[PDB]
Design a protein around this ligand. Structure first.
Ligand SMILES: *[C@@H]1O[C@H](CO)[C@@H](O[C@@H]2O[C@H](CO)[C@@H](O[C@@H]3O[C@H](CO[C@H]4O[C@H](CO)[C@@H](O)[C@H](O)[C@@H]4O)[C@@H](O)[C@H](O[C@H]4O[C@H](CO)[C@@H](O)[C@H](O)[C@@H]4O)[C@@H]3O)[C@H](O)[C@H]2NC(C)=O)[C@H](O)[C@H]1NC(C)=O
Ligand SMILES: *[C@@H]1O[C@H](CO)[C@@H](O[C@@H]2O[C@H](CO)[C@@H](O[C@@H]3O[C@H](CO[C@H]4O[C@H](CO)[C@@H](O)[C@H](O)[C@@H]4O)[C@@H](O)[C@H](O[C@H]4O[C@H](CO)[C@@H](O)[C@H](O)[C@@H]4O)[C@@H]3O)[C@H](O)[C@H]2NC(C)=O)[C@H](O)[C@H]1NC(C)=O
Ligand SMILES: *[C@@H]1O[C@H](CO)[C@@H](O[C@@H]2O[C@H](CO)[C@@H](O[C@@H]3O[C@H](CO)[C@@H](O)[C@H](O)[C@@H]3O)[C@H](O)[C@H]2NC(C)=O)[C@H](O)[C@H]1NC(C)=O
Ligand SMILES: *[C@@H]1O[C@H](CO)[C@@H](O[C@@H]2O[C@H](CO)[C@@H](O[C@@H]3O[C@H](CO)[C@@H](O)[C@H](O)[C@@H]3O)[C@H](O)[C@H]2NC(C)=O)[C@H](O)[C@H]1NC(C)=O
Ligand SMILES: *[C@@H]1O[C@H](CO)[C@@H](O[C@@H]2O[C@H](CO)[C@@H](O)[C@H](O)[C@H]2NC(C)=O)[C@H](O)[C@H]1NC(C)=O
Ligand SMILES: *[C@@H]1O[C@H](CO)[C@@H](O[C@@H]2O[C@H](CO)[C@@H](O)[C@H](O)[C@H]2NC(C)=O)[C@H](O)[C@H]1NC(C)=O
Ligand SMILES: CCCCCc1cc2c(Cc3cccc(CN)c3)cccc2nc1N
Ligand SMILES: CCCCCc1cc2c(Cc3cccc(CN)c3)cccc2nc1N
Ligand SMILES: *[C@@H]1O[C@H](CO)[C@@H](O)[C@H](O)[C@H]1NC(C)=O
Ligand SMILES: *[C@@H]1O[C@H](CO)[C@@H](O)[C@H](O)[C@H]1NC(C)=O
Ligand SMILES: *[C@@H]1O[C@H](CO)[C@@H](O)[C@H](O)[C@H]1NC(C)=O
Ligand SMILES: *[C@@H]1O[C@H](CO)[C@@H](O)[C@H](O)[C@H]1NC(C)=O
Ligand SMILES: *[C@@H]1O[C@H](CO)[C@@H](O)[C@H](O)[C@H]1NC(C)=O
Ligand SMILES: *[C@@H]1O[C@H](CO)[C@@H](O)[C@H](O)[C@H]1NC(C)=O
Ligand SMILES: *[C@@H]1O[C@H](CO)[C@@H](O)[C@H](O)[C@H]1NC(C)=O
Ligand SMILES: *[C@@H]1O[C@H](CO)[C@@H](O)[C@H](O)[C@H]1NC(C)=O
Ligand SMILES: *[C@@H]1O[C@H](CO)[C@@H](O)[C@H](O)[C@H]1NC(C)=O
Ligand SMILES: *[C@@H]1O[C@H](CO)[C@@H](O)[C@H](O)[C@H]1NC(C)=O
Ligand SMILES: *[C@@H]1O[C@H](CO)[C@@H](O)[C@H](O)[C@H]1NC(C)=O
Ligand SMILES: *[C@@H]1O[C@H](CO)[C@@H](O)[C@H](O)[C@H]1NC(C)=O
Lengths: 735, 735
C-alpha cells in the first residue's frame, strides 16, 4: 500500500494527481516509472526533489500549483527521464539545464516568450515539442522571440507546436525530420517559397487562424489589415509530397490556387472552415487536384447578409473520388434541391454529409437515395418543418465528437433531424428516404399523438431518439409500426406528463418483440390512464429517472404497485431521482426477479428493506448512493449470495455491523465513502477486492488501531484515495 | 435567549418546529401562549408534559414523530387551551378527556374511524372541528362510525369537516350553528330532504366527489354503480337561504335541477367541475336562477372521445349578471367563434375567462373586444398556432394560485397564450385585441428573429413574458415598438445562445425609456455579436443567473469587461450560477456604482477582493452564499459604511478576523451559517441585530467560553436555530 500516490501496473504508474501535495513526495515506490503529479500545490522543484527515483521515464507536473519555481538542472540527474510535461505553470522561461534524455517535452500554457539555445539545442533527443498557447488573445505577454537556428540541432524532431503565440513568420532553420508542424494562430501573414521547401517528410501542416475571419468570433480576433486573406506563395508547398493533413481554417481565403496541391498526391484531410469560399465552392479548380481526399471541411463559409435559395456546388466535386466525409455547416441557404447534389452522387465512398446550421427550410429528401452509400445524413439545427476556455489538446474550430451517437449509428443508415421544427409528422414526411436504422428527432417541438402510421415509410428504424419534445401520449398503437425497434429514447417529454387531466397512455411498449432499451427519464411521470403497468417480454433496460415514483407508489394508492413487473426480461433498472422517501415492500417485491442491476441513487431513502434482496437471486449491483440511509443490516449474507458491488456513498451510515466485510462471499466492491463512520470495529472484520472509505469522519485515537492491522493484513483490497481517508484533524488515517 | 424554541411577540409565540425534540421541552418561557411543536420526534404525551405552561391558548403537535401516545386528560389541566392541532399522528382514536376549553380542534390525517360522545360531546366550546382525511383511497382503514347525535350538543359549532372519510350518508342531528359543512369524498350517494333542512345558517356546503367521475383520476377512484350521478332530493336545499359556496365537483352530474337554487338568493361561488354537463351548458335552466353568482367553475366537463367544433354556451349565461370569473378548462373544442360567446358579452363584471386545456386550434380574437371589461383572458395550454400527495388544507380539484402573475396582471389587461404553438408571430397575429398590458407567450416554441414590428398592434404591453422559447436574437430593433415596456422576461431561451457560430444581438435593451426589470436567466450566454455591453438608462434590475460569465470574463479576454457598466440606474444584479471561480478586479470595478444589492451566490469563488467595495458606496446587500471562500478580510469597516446585510453561508471560512462584529457600523444582518468556524475568539468581539452560525463545527471546550459571555451580553442579536448551533459532539453550544 503506497502513499500518498496510488500505484498500478500497465510499465509502473504512480497516479499522484490532485492530492493537495505541497511538495514532491519522498515516499514513492522504487519500481515507479511514470509519476503523474499534476493538479497539486507544488511550488518549488530542486535537484533533491527526485533524489532517488530512477527509471522514472515520465513526469507530469501540469497545473502546479492548483507559479512553479524550478532550479536549473533540477531534473538533470534523472538519466532516464524521457517525457516531461509542465503545462499550465506560469513558467517565465524554458527551464535551464534540462536532462538531454528527453524525447517529449510539453510547455503549453506557460509564459515563455523566448525560445533559446540555452534551453533547447542541447536536447538532441526531442521527438515532440509542445510550446503552444503561451502568448495569445488579450493575455499580457510578449512577442515570441525565437533565437535563430535553435531547432536545426534537433535532427530527431518529428512534431513541433508553436500555435497560439505571436511569431509573425515561419521560423527558418527547421530540421527536415519534422512530420507535423503546428503554426495556428501565430499571426503570420505571408508564407514564402523558402518557408517549408526543405521539409520533405511533413504529413501535417496547420496554418489555421492566420489572417482570421473575425466576424462573430468567440475569442478576441485580430484581422489582417483590410480583412485580407493569408498570402501563400505559389511554390510554398512544392516539395511537400508527403502532406496528409492541411488545415487552413480561418485564414480569410477567397481564392484557392489549384496548383498549391500539384505535388501532394496523398492529401487526405483538408480543413477550409471559416473562410470566404462560396465562390470557390461553386467553381473551384482546386477540387480537380485531390483524387485521394477523404475528408473536406468547408464549414462556416457563409457570406454575411446573404441567404441564397440554393447551395451552389461545382461540378468539380464529382472528381473527389476517395471523398468520405463532406462538411458544409454554416453555408446558409434555404433549399436543398435534387439537382444541387448531382456532383456528389457518383462518389463511391461518400458516407457522411454534414449540413448542420444552414437554416435550411426545405429538403427534397428523395435526393439522398440517388447517392451511393450514405451512412450519416446529418441535418441537425436547421428549419425543416412539417482553466481554461479552450482546451489546448483538441481541435479549435470544431467539436471532434461523432455527429451521431455511435450506438445509434452502429445499427445502419442514419438521419439526424434533431433541432429542427418538425412539430408534426405528416403522412408523407419520410417518403423516399433510404432504409433508415438510426433516427434523431430530438428537439423539434413535437406535440403530436403518435398513432402507429407516422413511421410507415421507414419501418425498419432500430434506434429512435425522440428526446426533448412534448409528445402527447394519447394512442396505444404509437410507434408500433416499427416492428424492429430495439432502442427508444423518450427523455425530456414532460410537458403533457406533468398535467394530471390530460391522458397518458404507455401501453404500446408491449408490442415490440425486439425492444432492448427504453429511456423514460425526466418525464415527471406520476399518473397513467387506464393501464398502470409497463409490459414487455423483450425489454432488457428501463431508465425511469427523473419521474415521480414517490407519487406513483404513494402508500394510499395501489394502482401502480406492479408498474414494472410485466417487464419479464429486465436486467437493468434506473429508479434514480424519483424523490423516494421509502419504497413499500410489496412494490419492491414486484420488481422483476430477472434484475441484475438496480439503481435507486439520488432519492431520499431513510430506510431500505434488505430482507427483500432474497427474492432477487440474480442481482449483482445495488446502487443506493445519495440517499439518507441511517443503518445497514447485520445479516446481508443471509439475503444474498449474488451481490458483487454495493454502492452506499453519500448516506448517513455511522456503524458497520459484525462480519460485514468477511461474510458476503460474492461481494467484491463496497463503497461506503462519504458517510458518517467514526470507526470500524475489529468485530466487523475477504472476498473483497475494493473498499471505499474516503469522506468519513474517522475518529483517530487508540481505538482506530485494530482496522489498520486489517489493512496491512489484506493488500488485495484496493482502498482508493487514501489521502482523503482522513481523521476528523486532517491527517490521513495511514499516518 | 430561549431554548430550545425561538420566541417572538405578535400574543407570544414559541416557534418550536422541526427541532428534533424528543419530548415536550421543560425549558419554555412562562409568558408563552402559542407553542408550535410540530415536526418533532415526540412519541409520548402525559399530564406532566405541559406541567406549568398556563395561558397557552394554542398547541400544535402536528407530525409527531417526524405514532403519538397521548394519555387521557393529558391536556385536561390546561384551562386556557383553546386551539389544539394534532394532525398527521397516526392517532387510533380521538384522545380521551380533552380540556373542554377547546374552540378549534384538528384531527386531520389520523386513524380515527369512531367519532364518540366520550370524546366530543363534552367539548361545548368547539367552533371548528377538523376530522378530514382519515379513511380514504386505498388506505387500510375502517368505515367511519359516527355515534348518533354526537354533534347536537355542540351548539356553538360553526365549521365541521369530515371529508375523505367513508360516511355513506349525511349524519343526522347536526347543530344549526353550522355555517360551513365539508362532506367531500365521503361516499354519499343520496342527499335526502331531511338532510340539511334545519341548517338555516349554512354559508358553505361541499358535497364534491360523491359519485365521482373517475376517468383518468390521479387518485384511486370508485364510481357509484353505473357511473351514476349523485342523487339530490328536489327539496334537499330548501331552507338554505344563506348558502354562498356550493361545491358539486366530481359528482357525475348530467342534469341540474334549476329549482335546487330557488331559495338561495345570495349564491356566490358554484363549483361543477369534473361532471358531465356539456348538455346543461348548452341549454341549462339552472343559470336563470343565479343573478348574484360571481364565480362559476365548469372545468373538465369534456365528453370522452368527443371533439366538438365549437363550444356551446346557452343563451341563459346572459342572465348571470354578477358573474366575475367563468372557468371552462377541459371542455375540449377546436374553435372559438365570435358568435359562441355573445351570451357573455353584456355581462358587466365578467373580468376573467379561463379556457385553459381545451386543445383549441383557432380563436377569432376580435371577440374579446366586444366584451365589457375583460381583465384576464386566460388561454394557456391549447393549440393556437401562427407526506403527502394531497394537501388537506387546499382545494382538491384545482390549483388556487392566480391564473396570471399578480405583478404582470397589476399593469392592466392580460392575455396568457403560454404553452401554445405560436412558434412564429405573423404580421396580423394580434389584430383586434384590446389594449393588452400583460402578455404571456412562454413555451410556444418560438424561434423567430424579433425585428421591431411583431407587437405593433399591441404596442402598450408593459410586462412581457417570452420565457422558455428559442428566440434567435439576430436584429437590434427587436421589441422596440413596445415603448412602454417595463418588465421583460427572457429566461430559458438558451437554444441559439449556446451556439457560438450563430449571431447574438442584445443591443435593443437600450431603446426602452421605461424598462425596469430584465431577466436573462438560464440562457447560457457567453458570446455576443458586435456589441459586448448591456446599456440602459432606466433599468433597475438585471437577472443574469444561469449564464456563463466565467467565459465572458475569461482572463485572456477584454471584450466583456464593462458588460454591465452602461446600466447606469441599476440597483439589483443577480450574477448567481455563472460558474465563476474568480472575478477580475477591473470587471468587478466596472459593475454599476448605483448598485444597492448584488448576488453572486452559487458560483465557485475561491477569492473575493473586498477592497473593491470602496467603489460601491450605496451597496446594502452582498450575497456570496454557496461559493468556496476561504478567508474574510480584516478591514471591512475600511471598505464600506453602507453594508447592512452580508450573506456568506455555504463557504469555507474557518476564522473570524478581529473586530469583525463590532466595527462595521451599518451592518445589521450577518450570515455565517454552514462554514468551518471552530470558534469565535474574544478578539473578534454591536450594531448587529442578527447573526447566523448554525452549521459550523464549533469546537466545544474551555476556549469556546469567551463568546458565550458575549451572547449573554447582547440579547439584541437574534441568533436563530440555536439547536443547530452545535458542538462538533451533537449538543448545542448553549449547553
Ligand atoms: C487544424 O487541423 C489539424 C489537422 O486535423 C488539427 O490537427 C489535430 O490536432 C489535434 C489537437 O491537437 C490532435 O488531437 C490530439 O492528438 C493527440 C495525439 O493522438 C495520436 O496519437 C495517440 C497516441 O499517443 C493516439 O492515441 C491517437 O489516436 C492519435 O493517433 C491526443 O493525445 C489528443 O487526445 C488526448 O487529449 C484529448 C484532449 O481533449 C483527450 O480528449 C483525449 O482523451 C486524449 O487524452 C488529441 O486527440 C490531432 O491528432 C491532430 N491531427 C493529426 C492527424 O495529427 C489541428 O488541431 C487543427 N488546428 C486547430 C487550431 O484547430
Ligand atoms: C369545494 O369547494 C369549496 C368552496 O370553494 C372549497 O372550500 C374551500 O376549501 C379550502 C380548503 O380547505 C379552504 O382553504 C383554506 O382556508 C383556511 C381558512 O382561511 C379563511 O380564514 C383565514 C383566517 O383564519 C383567512 O386568513 C383566509 O383568508 C380565509 O378567509 C386557510 O387556513 C387555508 O390557508 C392556509 O393553509 C394553506 C394550505 O395550502 C396555505 O397555503 C396557506 O398559506 C394558509 O396557511 C386555506 O386557504 C377555503 O377557505 C374554503 N373556502 C371557503 C369560502 O370557506 C372546498 O375545499 C372544495 N372541496 C374540495 C375537496 O376541493
Ligand atoms: C437514455 O438511456 C440510455 C440507456 O441507458 C442512454 O444510452 C446509454 O448511455 C450510456 C452512457 O450513459 C452508454 O454506456 C456507455 O457506453 C460507452 C461506449 O461504449 C462507454 O464508453 C461508457 O463507459 C458507457 O458504458 C450506453 O451505450 C448507451 N446505450 C444506448 C443504447 O445508447 C441514453 O444516453 C439516455 N438518453 C438521454 C438523453 O439521457
Ligand atoms: C425573472 O426575474 C424576475 C425579476 O427578479 C422574477 O420576477 C420577480 O420574482 C420575485 C420572486 O422571485 C418577486 O418578488 C416576490 O414578490 C412577492 C409578492 O410581492 C413576495 O411575496 C416575495 O417575497 C418576493 O418579494 C418579484 O415581484 C418578481 N418581479 C416581477 C417584476 O415580476 C421572475 O420570476 C423571473 N422569471 C423566471 C421565469 O424565473
Ligand atoms: C440527437 O440530437 C441531439 C441534439 O443534437 C443530441 O444531443 C446532444 O448529445 C450530446 C452527447 O450527450 C450532448 O453533450 C449535447 O448536449 C446534446 N445536445 C443537445 C442540444 O441536447 C443527441 O445525442 C442525438 N442523438 C443521437 C442518437 O445521436
Ligand atoms: C407564463 O406562463 C407560464 C406557463 O403557464 C407560467 O409558468 C408557471 O409559473 C408558476 C409560478 O412560478 C410555476 O410554479 C409553474 O411551474 C410555471 N409553469 C411552467 C409550465 O413552467 C408563468 O408564470 C406565466 N407568466 C406570467 C407573467 O404570469
Ligand atoms: C450560420 C449562422 C448565421 C447567423 C445569422 C442568422 C441567419 C439566419 C437566416 C439566414 C439569413 C442570412 C443572411 C440574411 C438573411 C435575411 N435576413 C437570412 C435565417 C433565419 C434565421 C437566421 N438567424 C441568424 N442568427
Ligand atoms: C382535456 C384533456 C383531454 C385528454 C384527451 C386528449 C384530447 C386531445 C384532442 C381532443 C380530442 C378529444 C376527443 C377525441 C379527439 C379525436 N381523436 C380529439 C386533440 C388533440 C390532442 C389531444 N390529446 C389528448 N391527450
Ligand atoms: C522542389 O520540387 C521541384 C520540382 O518539383 C524541384 O526542382 C526542387 O529541387 C525541389 N526542391 C527541393 C529542395 O527538394
Ligand atoms: C473506397 O473505399 C474502399 C474501402 O472501403 C476502397 O476499397 C476503394 O478503393 C475506395 N474507392 C475509392 C474510389 O477511393
Ligand atoms: C390510434 O390512431 C389511429 C389513426 O387515426 C386510430 O385509428 C386508432 O383508433 C387510434 N387508437 C386508439 C387506441 O385510440
Ligand atoms: C399491441 O398488443 C396488444 C396486446 O398484446 C394487442 O391487443 C394490440 O392489438 C397490439 N397492437 C398492435 C398494433 O400490434
Ligand atoms: C430477453 O433478452 C435477451 C437479451 O437481450 C434476448 O436475447 C431475448 O430475445 C429476450 N427475450 C424475449 C422473450 O424477447
Ligand atoms: C420487509 O418487508 C416484509 C414484507 O415483504 C416485512 O414482513 C418485513 O417486516 C420488512 N422488514 C423491515 C425491516 O421493514
Ligand atoms: C323550508 O322552506 C319551506 C318553504 O320555503 C317552509 O315551508 C319550511 O317551513 C322550511 N323548513 C324549515 C325547517 O325551515
Ligand atoms: C359589478 O361590480 C360593481 C363593483 O365592482 C358593482 O357596483 C355592480 O353592482 C356590479 N354589477 C352587477 C350587475 O352585479
Ligand atoms: C430588423 O428587421 C427589419 C424588418 O425586416 C429590417 O428592416 C431591419 O433591417 C432589421 N434590422 C437590423 C439591424 O438588421
Ligand atoms: C435604438 O437606440 C439606438 C442608439 O440609442 C438608435 O441608433 C436606434 O436607431 C434605436 N432604434 C429604435 C427603433 O429606436
Ligand atoms: C431610474 O430608476 C428610477 C426608479 O425606477 C426611475 O424613476 C427613473 O426614471 C430611472 N431613470 C431613468 C433615467 O430612466
Ligand atoms: C484588488 O484589486 C485591486 C485593483 O483594482 C488590486 O490593486 C488589489 O491588489 C486587489 N486586492 C486583492 C486582495 O487581490
Amino acid at each position: 500500500r503506497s502513499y500518498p500516490c496510488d500505484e498500478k501496473k500497465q510499465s509502473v504508474i504512480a497516479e499522484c494527481s490532485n492530492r493537495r501535495l505541497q511538495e514532491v513526495p519522498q515516499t514513492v515506490g522504487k519500481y515507479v516509472t511514470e509519476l503523474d503529479l499534476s493538479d497539486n500545490f507544488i511550488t518549488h522543484i530542486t535537484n533533491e526533489s527526485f533524489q532517488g527515483l530512477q527509471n522514472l521515464t515520465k513526469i507530469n507536473l501540469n497545473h502546479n500549483p492548483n507559479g512553479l519555481n524550478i532550479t536549473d538542472g533540477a531534473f538533470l540527474n534523472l538519466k532516464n527521464l524521457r517525457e516531461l510535461l509542465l503545462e499550465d505553470n506560469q513558467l517565465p522561461q524554458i527551464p535551464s539545464g534540462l536532462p538531454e534524455s528527453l524525447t517529449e517535452l510539453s510547455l503549453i500554457q506557460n509564459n515563455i516568450y523566448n525560445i533559446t539555445k540555452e534551453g533547447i539545442s542541447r536536447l538532441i533527443n526531442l521527438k515532440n515539442l509542445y510550446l503552444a498557447w503561451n502568448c495569445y488573445f488579450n493575455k499580457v505577454c510578449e512577442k515570441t522571440n525565437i533565437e535563430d537556428g535553435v531547432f536545426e540541432t534537433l535532427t530527431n524532431l518529428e512534431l513541433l507546436s508553436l500555435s497560439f503565440n505571436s511569431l509573425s513568420h515561419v521560423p527558418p532553420k527547421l530540421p527536415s525530420s519534422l512530420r507535423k508542424l503546428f503554426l495556428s494562430n501565430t499571426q503570420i501573414k505571408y508564407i514564402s517559397e523558402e518557408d517549408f521547401k526543405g521539409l520533405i517528410n511533413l504529413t501535417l501542416l496547420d496554418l489555421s487562424g492566420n489572417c482570421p475571419r473575425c466576424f462573430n468570433a468567440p475569442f478576441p480576433c485580430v484581422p489582417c489589415d483590410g480583412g485580407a486573406s493569408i498570402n501563400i506563395d505559389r511554390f510554398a508547398f512544392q516539395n511537400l509530397t508527403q502532406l496528409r493533413y492541411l488545415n487552413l481554417s480561418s485564414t480569410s481565403l477567397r481564392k484557392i490556387n489549384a496548383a498549391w496541391f500539384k505535388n501532394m498526391p496523398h492529401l487526405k484531410v483538408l480543413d477550409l472552415e471559416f473562410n470566404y469560399l462560396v465562390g470557390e465552392i461553386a467553381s473551384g479548380a482546386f477540387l480537380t487536384m485531390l483524387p485521394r481526399l477523404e475528408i473536406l471541411d468547408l464549414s462556416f463559409n457563409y457570406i454575411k447578409g446573404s441567404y441564397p435559395q440554393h447551395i451552389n456546388i461545382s461540378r468539380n466535386f464529382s472528381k473527389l473520388l476517395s471523398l468520405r466525409a463532406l462538411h458544409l455547416r454554416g453555408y446558409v441557404f434555404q433549399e436543398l434541391r435534387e439537382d444541387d447534389f448531382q456532383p456528389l452522387m457518383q462518389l463511391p465512398n461518400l458516407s457522411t454529409i454534414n449540413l448542420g446550421i444552414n437554416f435550411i427550410k426545405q429538403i427534397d429528401f428523395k435526393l439522398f437515395q440517388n447517392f451511393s452509400n450514405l451512412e450519416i445524413i446529418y441535418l441537425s439545427e436547421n428549419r425543416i418543418s412539417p482553466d481554461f476556455e479552450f482546451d489546448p489538446h483538441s481541435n479549435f474550430y470544431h467539436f471532434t465528437r461523432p455527429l451521431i451517437k455511435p450506438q445509434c449509428a452502429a445499427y445502419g443508415k442514419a438521419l439526424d433531424l434533431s433541432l429542427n421544427s418538425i412539430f408534426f409528422i405528416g403522412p408523407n414526411q419520410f417518403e423516399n428516404l433510404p432504409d433508415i436504422a438510426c433516427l434523431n428527432l430530438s428537439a423539434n417541438s413535437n406535440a403530436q399523438v403518435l398513432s402507429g402510421t407516422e413511421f410507415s415509410a421507414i419501418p425498419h428504424v432500430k434506434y429512435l431518439d425522440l428526446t426533448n419534445n412534448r409528445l402527447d401520449f394519447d394512442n396505444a398503437s404509437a410507434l408500433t409500426e416499427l416492428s424492429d425497434l430495439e432502442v427508444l429514447d423518450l427523455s425530456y417529454n414532460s410537458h403533457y406528463f406533468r398535467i394530471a387531466g390530460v391522458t397518458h397512455h404507455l401501453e404500446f411498449i408491449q408490442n415490440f418483440t425486439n425492444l432492448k432499451v427504453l429511456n423514460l427519464s425526466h418525464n415527471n411521470i406520476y399518473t397513467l390512464t387506464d393501464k398502470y403497468n409497463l409490459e414487455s417480454k423483450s425489454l432488457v433496460e428501463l431508465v425511469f429517472s427523473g419521474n415521480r415514483l414517490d407519487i406513483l407508489w404513494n402508500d394510499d394508492d395501489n394502482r401502480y404497485i406492479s408498474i414494472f413487473k410485466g417487464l419479464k426480461n429486465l436486467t437493468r433498472l434506473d429508479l434514480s431521482l424519483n424523490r423516494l422517501k421509502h419504497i413499500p415492500n410489496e412494490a419492491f417485491l414486484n420488481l422483476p426477479a430477472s434484475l441484475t442491476e438496480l439503481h435507486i441513487n439520488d432519492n431520499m431513502l431513510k430506510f431500505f428493506n434488505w430482507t427483500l434482496l432474497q427474492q432477487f437471486p440474480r442481482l449483482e449491483l445495488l446502487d443506493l448512493r445519495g440517499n439518507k440511509l441511517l443503518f445497514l443490516t447485520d445479516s446481508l449474507s443471509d439475503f444474498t449470495s449474488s451481490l458483487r458491488t454495493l454502492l452506499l456513498s453519500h448516506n448517513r451510515i455511522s456503524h458497520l455491523p459484525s462480519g460485514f466485510l468477511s461474510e458476503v462471499s460474492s461481494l467484491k466492491h463496497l463503497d461506503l465513502s462519504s458517510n458518517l463512520l467514526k470507526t470500524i470495529n475489529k468485530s466487523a472484520l475477504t472476498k473483497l477486492s475494493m473498499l471505499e472509505l474516503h469522506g468519513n469522519p474517522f475518529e483517530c485515537t487508540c481505538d482506530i488501531g485494530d482496522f489498520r492491522r486489517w489493512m496491512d493484513e489484506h493488500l488485495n483490497v484496493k482502498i482508493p484515495r487514501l489521502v482523503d481517508v482522513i481523521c476528523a484533524r486532517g491527517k490521513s488515517i495511514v499516518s
